Write a protein that binds this ligand. Structure first.
Ligand code: EDH
Length: 294
């Protein structure tokens, strides 16, 4: 369900960055901004095709919309995400934006909403396999999140059974989502302290290492997070369950529709002594929670 496009109708504006594969650049098309992805080397052709056939089947507000695909120089034509990537908002530009507990929870809810749609696909469920903030885009002033890069570095978000070579299911995305939840709450890069080549993270995670626990994290959120981290994929919740849980929790996180507009100088202190401080503040959550339960 595409819509063939002629390159001459595009007219590029400027390169904005590289995706998981290929290059992305802003462009105009029929009186509206556009992002187009082209393959640099022909080795990326396989990824180009799979993403083409997969994105043609998806239609969800939390997944990047694919308009068409031109085969003259071979490129995908998608919607432009003005807000950039979530990874950039979290750890990127020199003037970093302030965000609240409501934004963090809202972002993770919207991500689970999109993945739940993929996992519900018929005949076969669609697994993303590369869920991480670099592949999550933001629009509407940083309020709306959209999943991108369906072509399938990423070791910090990968379930052990995946790089274990073992067979895996849709539950590998659940593991990645859990890491993302920890990441937005702490505004820390997962396993940044380990570093080195990728196999050093894989070894740690394979032996059961997980990101440190979060001081004063509400037990309902801690439970969900650590369940997603389970070694055994069958002990992880389905995305449908995560959506339901996160939806119910948002009752205690008002203000997710407030755009990102304030800067901050995120200090990020080196204090990984078992526990870790959250970046967001859960004071209001505990207050609103006590109102209902009392
Ligand atoms: C990695 C993010 C690159 N980037 C960006 N991407 C997109 O609009 C986009 C849209 C659809 C699909 C994809 C993809 N990867 O399949 C990407 N918009 C940006 C605006 C400012 C700075 C960087 C930007």
């Amino acid at each position: 369900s595409l819509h063939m496009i002629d390159y001459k109708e595009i007219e590029v504006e400027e390169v904005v960055g590289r995706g998981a594969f290929g290059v992305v650049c802003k462009a105009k098309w029929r009186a509206k901004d556009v992002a187009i992805k082209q393959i640099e080397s022909e080795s990326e052709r396989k990824a180009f095709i799979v993403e083409l056939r997969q994105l043609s089947r998806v239609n969800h507000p939390n997944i990047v919309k694919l308009y068409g695909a031109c085969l003259n120089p071979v490129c995908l034509v998608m919607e432009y995400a003005e807000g950039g990537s979530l990874y950039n908002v979290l750890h990127g530009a020199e003037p970093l934006p302030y965000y609240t507990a409501a934004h963090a929870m809202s972002w993770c809810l919207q991500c689970s909403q999109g993945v739940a749609y993929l996992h519900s696909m018929q005949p076969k469920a669609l697994i993303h396999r590369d869920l991480k903030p670099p592949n999550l885009l933001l629009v509407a002033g940083g309020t709306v999140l959209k999943i991108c890069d369906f072509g399938t570095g990423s070791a910090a978000w990968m379930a052990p059974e995946v790089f274990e070579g073992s067979n895996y299911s849709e539950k590998c995305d659940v593991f990645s989502w859990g890491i993302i939840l920890w990441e937005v709450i702490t505004r820390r890069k997962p396993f940044d302290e380990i570093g080195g080549p990728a196999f050093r993270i894989m070894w740690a995670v394979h032996n059961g290492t997980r990101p440190p626990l979060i001081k004063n994290l509400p037990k309902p959120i801690e439970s969900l997070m650590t369940r997603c981290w389970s070694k055994d994929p069958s002990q992880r919740p389905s995305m449908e369950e995560i959506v339901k849980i996160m939806t119910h929790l948002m009752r205690y996180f008002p203000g997710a529709d407030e755009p990102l507009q304030y800067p901050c100088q995120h200090s990020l202190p080196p204090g990984e002594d078992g526990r870790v401080e959250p970046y967001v503040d859960f004071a209001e959550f505990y207050r609103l929670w006590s109102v209902d339960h009392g």
